[PDB]
Structure formats: structure tokens, C-alpha cells
Amino acid sequence: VTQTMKGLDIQKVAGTWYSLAMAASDISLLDAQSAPLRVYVEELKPTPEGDLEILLQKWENGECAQKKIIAEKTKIPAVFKIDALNENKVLVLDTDYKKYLLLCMENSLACQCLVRTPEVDDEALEKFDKALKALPMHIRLSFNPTQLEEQCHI
Amino acid sequence: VTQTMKGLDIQKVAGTWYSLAMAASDISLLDAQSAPLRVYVEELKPTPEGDLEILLQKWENGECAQKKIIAEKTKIPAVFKIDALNENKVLVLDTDYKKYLLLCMENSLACQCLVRTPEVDDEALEKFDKALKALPMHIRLSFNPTQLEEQCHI
Ligand SMILES: CCCCCCCCCCCCCC(=O)O
Ligand SMILES: CCCCCCCCCCCCCC(=O)O
């Protein structure tokens, strides 16, 4: 991934988001309901000191569960690191703050097109697919407005 | 689907094919290993009287199984009908016979990009994605050359 948002103002991504589309390098990352990177973003919560808290839902043990994970800031504004067994980065590729936000996670690679409202934003999906053609994705999903209004996009 | 191959010569699609990419209208059609339209084409076998026999593999009961299904000809050369509880059509969208073949099945809709050899044919995938932008797909998968040489693309 060699797309990052120049001049990102992280405080301005705060609030409500919808995981409109997802893609990943390996089918197994997204294939099933309980696949490891089948995560549905609810809210982005920047800290005053510039970390990025992410509220999301994930299907685990036959149930739609709440998760809260902290992605810690780095020297680069558009790059955050999640504390785990593995060093994994969260990258903000692009955003206009008010409509769409493109982000990826890598260790191999998964990405999402986030939007502010439960609508199919063709313009944001164009920007997502453009970003992705530089990346070796083998699975891509997208949700309809009804699914976007349901826990775990059921 | 309002893309069919003009002047199709069905006898010339005979032989070996690889399911390089798949897409479908509903995630559930392709999501898991045993999803209903997760089928891997092995061979196309036109009959002398112009029907299209399809040899494929499908994951069923925790196993990669052989299937043979007959798609019967219609008045339209690029449209075939599979005998089931439901009337389902197989449509040949496009082919150059020697490299790629795009086909869909509808009742809602799933499509594949077939290629003759276990290679990622970027040119055929461009033609596949072009065909698909006219269609309401919500899941898309693609296979690497290693997976293409394995039973059920394992
Ligand atoms: C996949 C790109 C969008 C990034 C979404 C936020 C990153 C968090 C996903 C990592 C897995 C979270 C599940 C957990 O381990 O509790
Ligand atoms: C999905 C577009 C490619 C068409 C592949 C050939 C169509 C056959 C799939 C229908 C399901 C076959 C499994 C079975 O019912 O035995």
C-alpha cells in the first residue's frame, strides 16, 4: 500500500461510519461470516493525543459482538499501529471527511470503503476500486442500504 | 444481463477451462467454500445437437465433488436452460474461444471469467469487470495460478 492521505486531520474523521465495501488479499480473510477481517466499523474515535479508537462489530461464536480496538499513532499522520503478536498497520488512504474514508490494514492486506450514511456512494466506490487496482485483492464484498442498517450487515 | 455473444459457435467452446474469477448478486451465493454457486468449471462439452454439458467441481459435505450438469439449447445460440425446480438460464456473454469465456447464470445472478490456462489474464479480467458494471454484484472472487491447479481451488 503506497497510498496515504496527505495532510490528514485525524480529529475530523471522528464519528459515525458504515463499511460499504471490503476487499482483501486472501479470500479466507473475508469469505465467511466469521472470517478474521469481516469487521463492520461503527465509529471512529480519535483521542486528543492523536490515537484512533475504532468501535466495530464482528461475528464470533455464532453472535454479532461489539469490539473496541486502539490503533496507536505513529510519526506519520495517516499510519496507526495496533498492539498484537504481530505488528499490523492501519493506513488512511483517502477521505473527504464528510462523505467517504478509505482505509486498509496490513501485517496480508484488507481494505474498506467507509461512508457516513447508509447509501451506495458510487463515487466513493470508484475511488475505492482505483485504490485497489494497485493492490493484490482476491475478494471484494459490498453491502446494500438495508444490510448497512443491520448488526453485522445481516 | 443484456450482454450476449453475437455469432456464438458453441462447438468451439469445447474443452478445458479454469474459473479464474467469479461474481454474484448476493454474498451468500459465493461466500463460503460450500456456497451454492461456488462451482469450479473443469470442461465444457457441447453436444452434436447443440446442448452444453458442463463438468465442474463443487465443495459438498466437507468434500470436493465432481458434477456434470446439462444446459439445454434454446432458440437463442448464447442462451441455455438447466432443468430444475426453477427455470435458470446460462448465458454466454463473450468469448474469443482460444483464451477467455464470460458466462453468467440467472434465475439471482452469478457470473464467471473462464480462461484456457492457469494464468491471471488481466485482459480477460478487464472484459469481465466491464461486463459486471452493468450488473448488481455484491461479491467477487479471483484465484491465483496455484489455486487454479487444485481441486476446488484449495
Ligand atoms: C480492514 C480495514 C479496516 C480496518 C478496520 C479496523 C481494524 C481492526 C481489525 C482487526 C481485527 C479486529 C478484531 C479483534 O481482533 O478484536
Ligand atoms: C455461475 C456462472 C457459471 C456457470 C457454471 C455452470 C452452471 C452450473 C451451476 C449450477 C449449480 C450446479 C450444482 C448442482 O446443482 O449440481
From Swiss-Prot, chains A, B:
GO CC annotations, alphabetized: extracellular region
Major localization class: secreted
Keyword flag Phosphoprotein: no
CDD domains (alphabetical): lipocalin_beta-LG-like
Disulfide-linked positions: 64-152, 104-111, 104-113
Compartments in which it is found: Secreted
KW Cytoplasm (keyword) present: no
GO MF annotation list: identical protein binding; long-chain fatty acid binding; retinol binding
Post-translational modification (record): Alternate disulfide bonds occur in equal amounts in all variants examined.
Keywords for the protein's UniProt record, in alphabetical order: Allergen, Disulfide bond, Milk protein, Retinol-binding, Secreted, Signal, Transport
Organ and tissue specificity: Synthesized in mammary gland and secreted in milk.
InterPro entries: Blactoglobulin (IPR002447), Calycin (IPR012674), Lipocalin (IPR002345), Lipocalin_CS (IPR022272), Lipocln_cytosolic_FA-bd_dom (IPR000566)
Coiled coil: none
SUPFAM superfamilies referenced in this protein's UniProt entry, alphabetically: Lipocalins (SSF50814)
Protein purpose: Primary component of whey, it binds retinol and is probably involved in the transport of that molecule.
Oligomer status and interactors: Under physiological conditions beta-lactoglobulin exists as an equilibrium mixture of monomeric and dimeric forms. Interaction with LMBR1L which mediates the endocytosis of LGB has been observed in PubMed:17991420, but not in PubMed:23964685.
Membership in a protein family: Belongs to the calycin superfamily. Lipocalin family.
PANTHER family for the chain: GLYCODELIN (PTHR11430:SF117), LIPOCALIN (PTHR11430)
Name of protein: Beta-lactoglobulin
